[PDB]
Amino acid sequence: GAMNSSNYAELFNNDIKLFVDDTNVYRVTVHKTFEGNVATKAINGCIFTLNPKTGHLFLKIIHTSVWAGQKRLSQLAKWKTAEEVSALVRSLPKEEQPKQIIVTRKAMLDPLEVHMLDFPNIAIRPTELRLPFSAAMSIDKLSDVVMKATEPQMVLFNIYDDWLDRISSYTAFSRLTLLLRALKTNEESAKMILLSDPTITIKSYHLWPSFTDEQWITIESQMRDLILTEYGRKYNV
Amino acid sequence: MNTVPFTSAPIEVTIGIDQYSFNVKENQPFHGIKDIPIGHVHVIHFQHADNSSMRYGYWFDCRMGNFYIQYDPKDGLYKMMEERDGAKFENIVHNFKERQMMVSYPKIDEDDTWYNLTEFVQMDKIRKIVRKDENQFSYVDSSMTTVQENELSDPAHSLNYTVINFKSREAIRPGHEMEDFLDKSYYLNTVMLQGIFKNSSNYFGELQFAFLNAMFFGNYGSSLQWHAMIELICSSATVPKHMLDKLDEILYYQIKTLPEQYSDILLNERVWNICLYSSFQKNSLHNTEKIMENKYPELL
Ligand SMILES: Cc1cc(C(=O)Nc2ccc(N)cc2)co1
């Protein structure tokens, strides 16, 4: 069934699972033409596929060439996503294949189900959660590899850096989602928060700064405040 | 013209013969139905006055034998049987006609309804869907489940309709996942028409037989099958022009005949709105769309 607030710890058990998010797969800028009409120009995108227990992220880069000469791109994007996720599963040894794939938008269920007909034992699930994975292109290093790509490409990351050496996957996923929610609500502020103190750096093999335990508490509180405050103004408290 | 005599009518029952239905009282002197048109299949069917639950009935063709109905008080139902002694059968029928204890199949001469509803239905194909090879006629009732329904429990008493599943390897060619799911022409034309049904007549015959079992017995799996087969055509971009035109005629009579008060349980809102308004064939069912919009605009 659908994933929601009540079956939330299931993400962190020992059944292999992936989140797939397609919100950054087909990306465009809208502009005016010389004749005063409007036109889009596509830019590179990415499939965001994440194992919430290990942090492993499989970032499939979608180069703009894949849209050349195609119609109904928004619809093709969902099928392209399903095609790539299916190739990913097939590339993995059986014992690493997921038992579930949770899609963050219901429009993806049918494209993924059809592409996964060969894996009847892999459950394709929606979710009721409003997860912020769309803000993944606000993470500087992820944006940079997507925009620099000149051909299709898969890049592998650990989106929790080394956090699991000190925190549980439940705590890690809660941190990640707070950081991404913050980045989605107010990117500038969220980023100022993360980098204000220039003495806390991002290792070359990491995505986020090397905060201490106590510094993460302060950071986490600052991201909660920022998220609070636009709920303190969007519904006129 | 042919006759189906009844040994007697011991229990109060509503009897149906195709679209005509009449009330018979407990031990009324009723001895059968005469003047039944030769050349078509037929369905006789019963609803006991005591138990509106379980409408059931028998498909048959009068060319395949002499058939009669007889109540069984152990099993509690009107049973169809075959009389092999042809002299005995003519003698019985004649006596009952002379004494005028038979109702007449009441066909108006202008009316092509039954033909239009059974055009492609053949007894030989019915007997393959309803497996019971020792009888020339076929029993159906409200509760019988389909082969696809049993996959999702008694396989002997099932409706073996052709399985259609839009999210199946059969439906979907590797490497055309998107193309084949959004435009089912491959599944319709190659898998089903050329592969399984052989021709569109056989396809239409199963479709009419599914509708008829849905309408007369409220056989839920039959209704599911009818909508599936309509949807497979409507969701195919490439359909022979002769099939489209015939499909519009088929559906038209089905909707014309469908009882108005069972339209909420026998019509699937989603399938119809999709077929009439979104599908490739949204402009190809003029008669069906015209009758649907004047009779059931609530569904749309
Ligand atoms: C539950 C349910 C009852 C019936 C029904 O009675 N059908 C029917 C019967 C006779 C005619 N002419 C036409 C239709 C269908 O479903």
Structure tokens of B105? Answer: 């199949």
Cα distance between residue B180 and residue B178, in whole Å: 6
Judge: B177–A110 Cβ closer than 8 Å, yes or no: no
Residue B234 to residues A40, A132, A183, A187: CA-CA distances in angstroms?
A: 33, 39, 46, 47
Nearest CA to ligand 1 atom 15: B218
Task: Point out the residue among A82, A117, A118 whose CB comes nearest to the CB of B167.
Answer: A117
User: How many CB atoms within 10 Å of residue B2?
Assistant: 19
**Closest to B12 measured CA to CA, from B40, B44, B47:** B47
Q: Number of CB pairs < 8 Å for A and B?
A: 22
Structure tokens of B28? Answer: 């009324």
**Closest to B172 measured CA to CA, from A106, A110, A121:** A110
Q: Which residues of A fall within a CB distance of 8 Å from B169?
A: 117-118
**Cα of B126 from ligand 1 centre, angstroms:** 20
Task: Point out the residue among A76, A82, A114 whose CB comes nearest to the CB of B167.
Answer: A114
The Cα of B168 is separated from the nearest Cα of chain A by a number of Å equal to 7
Judge: B181–A114 Cβ closer than 8 Å, yes or no: yes
A114, A116, A124: best mutation site toward chain B, by most B Cβ within 10 Å? A114
Q: Are A131 and A46 in contact (CB under 8 A)?
A: no
User: How many CB atoms within 10 Å of residue B184?
Assistant: 27
The pick from B142, B144, B216 for probing ligand 1's pocket by mutation, whose C-beta has the most ligand atoms within 8 angstroms, reads: B216
**Cα of A173 from ligand 1 centre, angstroms:** 57
Cα distance between residue A14 and residue B179, in whole Å: 36
Cα distance between residue A212 and residue A237, in whole Å: 34
**Closest to B12 measured CA to CA, from B71, B68, B69, B54:** B71
B173, B178, B179, B182: best mutation site toward chain A, by most A Cβ within 10 Å? B178
User: How many CB atoms within 10 Å of residue B14?
Assistant: 15
Q: Which residues of B fall within a CB distance of 8 Å from A114?
A: 167, 172, 177-178, 181
Q: Which residue has the tokens 């193309």?
A: B179
Radius of gyration (C-alpha) of chain A in whole angstroms: 19
Judge: A110–B169 Cβ closer than 8 Å, yes or no: no
**Closest to B103 measured CA to CA, from B40, B50, B44:** B44
Structure tokens of B283? Answer: 């402009």
Radius of gyration (C-alpha) of chain B in whole angstroms: 21
Judge: B167–A111 Cβ closer than 8 Å, yes or no: no
CA B70 to chain centre: 23
DSSP state of A3: B
User: How many CB atoms within 10 Å of residue B274?
Assistant: 16
**Closest to B276 measured CA to CA, from B241, B189, B268:** B268
CATH numeric code, B116-299? 1.25.40.550
Pairing relationship of beta strands B32-36 and B103-104 according to DSSP bridges: parallel
Q: What residues of B are in the A interface, CB distance below 8 Å?
A: 167-169, 172, 177-178, 181
Task: Point out the residue among A79, A113, A117 whose CB comes nearest to the CB of B178.
Answer: A79
The Cα of B70 is separated from the nearest Cα of chain A by a number of Å equal to 49
Secondary structure (3-state) at A27: strand
Pairing relationship of beta strands A123-125 and A100-103 according to DSSP bridges: parallel
**Cα of B215 from ligand 1 centre, angstroms:** 6
**Closest to A157 measured CA to CA, from A200, A203, A96:** A203
Ligand 1 pocket member B215 (CB < 6 A): yes
User: Residue B199 burial by CB count (10 A; 0-12/13-18/19+): exposed, middle or buried?
Assistant: exposed
Sequence-distant (6+) residues with CB within 8 A of A174 are none
Cα distance between residue B40 and residue B119, in whole Å: 8
Q: Which residues of A fall within a CB distance of 8 Å from B168?
A: 117
A71, A117, A118: best mutation site toward chain B, by most B Cβ within 10 Å? A117
Amino acid at B91: N
- What's the per-residue H, E or C state across chain B? CEEEEECCCCCCEEEEECCEEEEECCCCCCCEEEEECCCCCEEEEEEECCCCCCCEEEEECHHHCEEEEEEECCCCEEEEEEECCHHHHHHHHHHHHHCCCCEECCCCCCCCHHHHHHCCCCHHHHHHHCCCCCCCCEEEECCCCEHHHHHCCCHHHCECCCCCCCCCCCCCCCCCHHHHHHCCHHHHHHHHHHHHHCCHHHHHHHHHHHHHHHHHHCCHHHHHHHHHHHHHHHCCCCCCHHHHHHHHHHHHHHHHHCCHHHHHHHCCHHHHHHHHHCCCCCCCCHHHHHHHHHHCCCCC
Kindly give the interhelix angle for B220-234 and B200-217, rounded to the nearest 10 degrees: 140
Judge: B167–A82 Cβ closer than 8 Å, yes or no: no
CA B224 to chain centre: 13
Neighbour order of strands in the sheet with B20-24: B20-24, B13-17, B42-48, B56-60, B138-141
**Closest to B183 measured CA to CA, from A75, A140, A235:** A75
Strand-pair partners of A123? A100
Q: What is the DSSP string of A66-134?
A: GGTT-S-HHHHHHHHHHHHHHHHHHHS-GGGS-SEEEESSGGGHHHHHHHTTT-TTSEEE-B-----GG
Q: Which residue has the tokens 């707070």?
A: A178
- CA neighbours within 13 Å on the CB side: how many for B255? 23
How many residues are recorded in chain B?
A: 300
Cα distance between residue A58 and residue A47, in whole Å: 8
Nearest CA to ligand 1 atom 1: B218
Q: Are B123 and B42 in contact (CB under 8 A)?
A: no
Residue of chain B whose alpha carbon sits nearest to that of A109: B167
- CA neighbours within 13 Å on the CB side: how many for A197? 12
Judge: B167–A76 Cβ closer than 8 Å, yes or no: no
Secondary structure (3-state) at A157: strand
Q: Which residues of B fall within a CB distance of 8 Å from A87?
A: none
Nearest CA to ligand 1 atom 13: B216
- CA neighbours within 13 Å on the CB side: how many for B174? 3
Neighbour order of strands in the sheet with B2-5: B2-5, B32-36, B103-104
What are chain A's domains? 9-163 (3.30.420.230), 164-237 (1.20.80.40)
Kindly give the interhelix angle for B241-257 and B220-234, rounded to the nearest 10 degrees: 150
Nearest CA to ligand 1 atom 12: B19
Residue B126 to residues A51, A107, B55, B139, B198: CA-CA distances in angstroms?
A: 52, 40, 19, 10, 16
Structure tokens of B279? Answer: 């599908």
Amino acid at A165: D
Cα distance between residue A25 and residue A80, in whole Å: 9
Judge: B167–A113 Cβ closer than 8 Å, yes or no: yes
Cα distance between residue A157 and residue B22, in whole Å: 75
Nearest CA to ligand 1 atom 10: B216
Sequence-distant (6+) residues with CB within 8 A of B264 are none
Q: Which residue has the tokens 């938008």?
A: A105
Q: Are B130 and B57 in contact (CB under 8 A)?
A: no
**Closest to A59 measured CA to CA, from A151, A160, A136, A114:** A136
Element (H, E) at A145: helix A140-148
Q: Which residues of B fall within a CB distance of 8 Å from A109?
A: none
Pairing relationship of beta strands A153-158 and A123-125 according to DSSP bridges: unpaired
Atom of ligand 1 nearest to the CA of B266: 16
Residue of chain A whose alpha carbon sits nearest to that of B167: A114
